[PDB]
């Protein structure tokens, strides 16, 4: 059914499916107090991420087990791009929530997190410099969930791979349509598509580094880990 949507319906769909912005629990942070807040926040946002996924056009047509494998490998890239996007208009700060605006220096309060902040901030500026739009943003977040684990899913898997690649193509049509409607020159549209798609690369990299840090902090008993968040943490190692 999803394969039959126009560029405008897919855009609308995705715009309606966006999850809400959550708040953080209420002098200087400690290593433990700071991971406790981020973790308590990421754990509340995954429940919302599960229900945003289901509304992404085409996701529910996958076998349950492909649905899990996809959320299981993309959860931290989806959390990262939402963060970058809400931090866009606050140069030098990461807006974890409306009541938790952290800067590079607070990043130093937790061992080895500053490098992770530094990359989130650089992607945040990158998106500011290109002037990313909300319509584009929603398309990117869907490509990220569909491209997390297609090379990690044999006759029903090749069938599920093709359906997945068909959604990806429609999302690629949508993005091309958004840029045409804002008057980009034909040349300019593929230059911007490719620039958006190379930032996903960086996002994948922030993610792998993010899992490592998380799992380090967990193995040092620095933070207890939430039920849904632990489950998802374990899908990567395991």
């Amino acid at each position: 059914l999803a394969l039959s949507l126009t560029a405008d319906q897919m855009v609308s769909a995705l715009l309606d499916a966006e999850p809400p912005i959550l708040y953080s629990e209420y002098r200087p942070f400690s290593e433990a107090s700071m991971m406790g807040l981020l973790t308590n926040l990421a754990d509340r946002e995954l429940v919302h991420m599960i229900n945003w996924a289901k509304r992404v056009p085409g996701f529910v047509d996958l076998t349950l087990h492909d649905q899990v494998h996809l959320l299981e490998c993309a959860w931290l890239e989806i959390l990262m791009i939402g963060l970058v996007w809400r931090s866009m208009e606050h140069p030098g700060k990461l807006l974890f929530a409306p009541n938790l605006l952290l800067d590079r220096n607070q990043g130093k309060c937790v061992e080895g997190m500053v490098e992770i902040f530094d990359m989130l901030l650089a992607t945040s500026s990158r998106f500011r410099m290109m002037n990313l739009q909300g319509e584009e943003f929603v398309c990117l977040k869907s490509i990220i969930l569909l491209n997390s684990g297609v090379y990690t899913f044999t006759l029903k898997s090749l069938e599920e791979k093709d359906h997945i690649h068909r959604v990806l193509d429609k999302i690629t049509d949508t993005l091309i349509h958004l840029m045409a409607k804002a008057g980009l020159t034909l040349q300019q549209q593929h230059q911007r598509l490719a620039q958006l798609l190379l930032i996903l690369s960086h996002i994948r990299h922030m993610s792998n580094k993010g899992m490592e840090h998380l799992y380090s902090m967990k193995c040092k008993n620095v933070v207890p880990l939430y039920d849904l968040l632990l489950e998802m943490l374990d899908a990567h190692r395991l």
Binding site: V47, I50, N51, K54, L64, Q67, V68, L71, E72, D227, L228, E231, M232
Partner: peptide, 9 residues
């Protein structure tokens, strides 16, 4: 099974 219970609901 957290994730699964939420895909079925």
């Amino acid at each position: 099974n957290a994730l699964l219970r939420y895909l079925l609901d």
